A paper describes a structure:
We provide high-resolution crystal structures for the enzyme in complex with a poor donor substrate (UDP-Gal) and a donor mimic (UDP-2F-Glc), as well as the enzyme in complex with a peptide acceptor (FGNWTT) and UDP, together with kinetic/ITC experiments and QM/MM metadynamics simulations of the reaction mechanism. We used 500 µM concentrations of the sugar nucleotides and the peptide (saturated conditions found for UDP-Glc and the peptide), and found that the initial velocity with UDP-Gal was ~40-fold lower than that of UDP-Glc and completely inactive with either UDP-2F-Glc or UDP-5S-Glc, implying that we could potentially trap co-crystals of AaNGT complexed to UDP-Glc mimetics and the peptide. In contrast, the UDP-Gal and UDP-2F-Glc pyrophosphates are only recognized by the side chains of Lys440 and Asn520. The sugar molecules interact with the side chains of His276 and Ser277. Furthermore, the Gal moiety specifically interacts with the Gly369 backbone, while the 2F-Glc moiety interacts with the side chain of His370. The superposition of all ligands for all three structures (AaNGT/UDP, AaNGT/UDP-Gal, and AaNGT/UDP-2F-Glc) clearly shows that the sugar moieties of UDP-Gal and UDP-2F-Glc collide with Gly2-1 and Asn30. This suggests that the sugar nucleotides adopt unproductive conformations in their respective enzyme complexes, which could explain why we were unable to get a ternary complex resembling a Michaelis complex at a structural level. Furthermore, this could also explain why UDP-Gal is a poor substrate, and UDP-Glc mimetics are inhibitors of AaNGT. The interaction of the 2-OH and the β-phosphate group could explain why the enzyme cannot recognize UDP−2F-Glc in a productive manner. Diffraction was poor for crystals obtained in the presence of UDP-5S-Glc, thus precluding obtaining useful data with this sugar nucleotide. Attempts to obtain a ternary complex that resembles a Michaelis complex by combining the UDP-2F-Glc or UDP-Gal with the peptide yielded a complex without peptide (see below for an explanation).
Soluble HMW1C-like N-glycosyltransferases (NGTs) catalyze the glycosylation of Asn residues in proteins, a process fundamental for bacterial autoaggregation, adhesion and pathogenicity. In contrast, NGTs are two-domain enzymes that consists of an N-terminal all-α domain (AAD) and a C-terminal catalytic domain that adopts a GT-B fold, as shown for Actinobacillus pleuropneumoniae NGT (ApNGT). We focused on AaNGT, an inverting GT that catalyzes the transfer of Glc from UDP-Glc to Asn residues in the consensus sequence Asn-X-Ser/Thr. The heart-shaped structure of AaNGT, either complexed to UDP-Gal/UDP-2F-Glc or UDP-peptide, shows the N-terminal AAD domain and C-terminal GT-B fold catalytic domain, which is composed of an N- and C-Rossman fold subdomains.
Author numbering: 0 to 621
The structure:
């Protein structure tokens, strides 16, 4: 084959380690992990030999890969000759989420075997305690392999006093994975969310942290269960803001209000906007309905297809990866239009958007809930959101512009099936239960809750998990996590193409929604197949969307659960009462609630926002 760049090689990596060329070794290692990061856990285009038996057995080949990569890393890190640079460590923290999987999808589970070689204290109380010689080289080796699935004891105060920078870097790393679900991982992260924000405020800059997974940090805290999970977002905002000013940022000066073709100018900063992404399917209709009230400049990237740019009076490309340049291009774009309104429909998916959220480009800066969590940023005034999707407003630092239920009509996907065949099984022997859930939405409570349902159900149940983001080397880890709760009563399906995903669900007799962070598109998917399921509701928007959307689709209120314990009774009831279940499905199939989502009056967004530029003009003047 001919190709753009040389593939990373397990063999090169192995050579390096034999030759005790540590520099090459770290390099090959870093290049492997990066490539895996780029492919979301897929290992195609990593070079390694392997027994022919594994040619057609992908899951087995993956495990084989992870085991073999584990062993090489072991041979390397237990070398006491091996000196890790700070830069070196910093780069590893960025890809620690992938290091975790090298071990966790291997039979070895974690790298605690490597940690044990660093202990220097033969007279210690518990094996779970590693005592280190007081030099920095070995501390960084230790931190780097302090993986989510570690059983080794670490105390944050102790560590934080030893080296703020490392301790912070590791806390970043442990919030970074898209699957933080196992008791060991979820508990490491729970603790960090309570302990770290205080310590994070104290940073002036991102210079000494793994800057490149910052956005993962920001997004992922919404998947804990703590009332106050979002606190780390405040602390991070401050650091980013601080880091922005040290770069020589001047907040844009609010003077005039440029008009175009009558209407004032709205700048829309986009993260992941293709007509295929759900950010379009939800928040594109409301954006066009605001061109009658405003003039829309949309700033996205190359990736955005034609149909995506056509939702703007005009669309500009962001010029590359450099954040400061991205902000320069946005400042001049807002000065040149004395722009009135900055709208970001998603904030979190791109780091540069979080930097934007901590500066002044417009007198009315608004977000929506492409990622449904507050920002804890002072430079963000309002949040667009459908009214039936709201729990407590106290969950948000901003002010909630609560729109009617129809204000945000969804454009369906043009992969959506039209000939769908329906499967209402009467008196099935095993009630097959589907769970549409990306990996971020799995945790010990949810899996404990499913274990309980299975134990208590008076009927046989099998869980099929359709696991968005469980790709490549992620999956064996995840599948095991599920087996650890449900043994032979669950199947864990990898990330699949859409039609295949639907085939998995179409095979179920009902579905269950994860909590705390619930589903949206998964419920469209649910009714699309003519199914009913259960969900939880809660104060946070990502808890409550489910409640709302159920109601909007004309499913009854008993399928909605305030407590974990409610969830169980309802789940069981719906698995037990076959005749009830089918009656509810027959309801939904005939009363096609779905088509009502593509219905609605999309104007309210632009109106409510003009109404605020009105109120803003009159309190300040122009
Ligand atoms: O094996 C699989 C599993 C799922 N899918 C499909 O992936 C889609 C992603 O939405 P899904 O409900 O899975 O995740 P969700 O949290 O809603 O993601 C959106 O909301 C997220 C909130 O931040 C946002 O990050 C994200 O971009 C949004 F999509 C959904 O249509 C599934 O039908 C698939 O094709 N194959």
């Amino acid at each position: 084959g001919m190709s753009r760049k040389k593939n990373p090689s397990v063999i090169q990596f192995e050579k390096a380690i034999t030759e005790k060329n540590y520099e090459a070794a770290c390099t090959e290692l870093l290049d492997i992990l990066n490539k895996i990061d780029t492919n979301f856990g897929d290992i195609e285009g990593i070079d390694f030999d392997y027994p022919q038996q594994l040619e057609t057995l992908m899951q087995d080949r993956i495990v084989y890969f992870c085991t073999r990569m584990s062993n090489a890393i072991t041979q390397l890190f237990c070398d006491p000759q091996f000196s890790l640079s700070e830069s070196g460590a910093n780069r590893f923290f960025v890809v620690q989420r992938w290091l975790n999987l090298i071990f966790a999808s291997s039979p070895y589970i974690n790298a605690d075997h490597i940690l044990q070689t660093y202990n220097c204290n033969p007279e210690r109380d518990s094996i779970y305690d590693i005592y280190l010689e007081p030099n920095k080289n070995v501390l960084m080796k230790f931190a780097v392999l302090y993986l989510p699935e570690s059983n080794v004891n670490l105390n944050l105060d102790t560590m934080w006093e030893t080296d703020k920078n490392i301790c912070g870097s590791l806390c970043f790393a442990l919030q970074s994975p898209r699957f933080i679900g196992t008791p060991a991982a979820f508990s490491k992260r729970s603790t960090i969310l309570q302990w770290f924000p205080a310590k994070l405020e104290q940073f002036h800059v991102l210079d000494d942290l793994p800057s490149n997974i910052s956005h993962d940090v920001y997004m992922h805290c919404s998947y804990d269960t703590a009332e106050n999970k979002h606190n780390v977002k405040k602390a991070l905002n401050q650091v980013i803001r601080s880091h922005l000013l040290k770069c020589g940022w001047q907040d844009r000066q609010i003077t005039q209000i440029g008009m175009r073709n009558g209407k004032p100018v709205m700048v829309v900063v986009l993260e992941h906007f293709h007509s295929s992404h759900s950010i379009y399917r939800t928040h594109s209709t409301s954006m066009i309905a605001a061109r009658e009230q405003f003039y829309l400049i949309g700033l996205g990237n190359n990736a955005v297809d034609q149909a995506g740019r056509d939702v703007f009076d005009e669309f500009h490309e962001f010029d590359g990866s450099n954040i400061l340049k991205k902000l320069a291009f946005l400042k001049e774009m807002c000065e040149k239009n004395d722009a009135a309104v900055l709208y970001m429909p998603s904030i979190g998916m791109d780091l540069a958007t979080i930097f934007v959220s901590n500066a002044r480009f417009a007198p009315i800066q608004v977000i929506a809930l492409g990622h449904p969590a507050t920002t804890h940023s002072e430079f963000i005034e309002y949040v667009i959101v459908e009214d039936d999707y709201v729990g407590s407003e106290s969950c948000f630092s901003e002010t909630l512009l609560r729109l009617p239920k129809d204000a945000l009509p969804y454009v369906p996907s043009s992969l959506a099936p039209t000939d769908v065949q329906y499967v209402l099984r009467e008196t099935p022997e095993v009630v097959n239960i589907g769970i549409a859930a990306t990996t971020m939405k799995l945790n010990p409570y949810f899996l404990e809750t499913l274990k309980t349902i299975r134990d208590r159900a008076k009927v046989k149940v099998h869980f099929h998990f359709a696991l968005g983001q469980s790709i490549g080397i992620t999956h064996p880890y995840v599948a095991r996590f599920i087996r650890s709760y449900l043994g032979d009563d669950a199947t864990a399906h990898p990330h699949s193409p859409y039609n295949r995903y639907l085939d998995i669900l179409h095979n179920c007799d009902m579905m269950l929604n994860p909590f705390p962070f619930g589903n949206t598109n998964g419920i469209i998917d649910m009714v699309t197949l003519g199914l009913v399921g259960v969900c939880k509701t809660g104060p946070e928007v990502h808890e409550h969307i489910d409640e709302g959307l159920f109601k909007r689709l004309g499913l009854p209120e008993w399928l909605i659960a305030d407590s974990v314990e409610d969830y169980i009774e309802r789940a069981i009831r719906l698995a037990e009462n076959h005749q009830e279940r089918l009656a509810l499905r027959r309801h939904i199939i005939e009363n096609n609630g779905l088509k009502t989502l593509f219905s609605g009056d999309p104007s309210p967004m632009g109106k409510t926002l003009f109404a605020k530029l009105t109120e803003w003009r009159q309190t300040n003047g122009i």
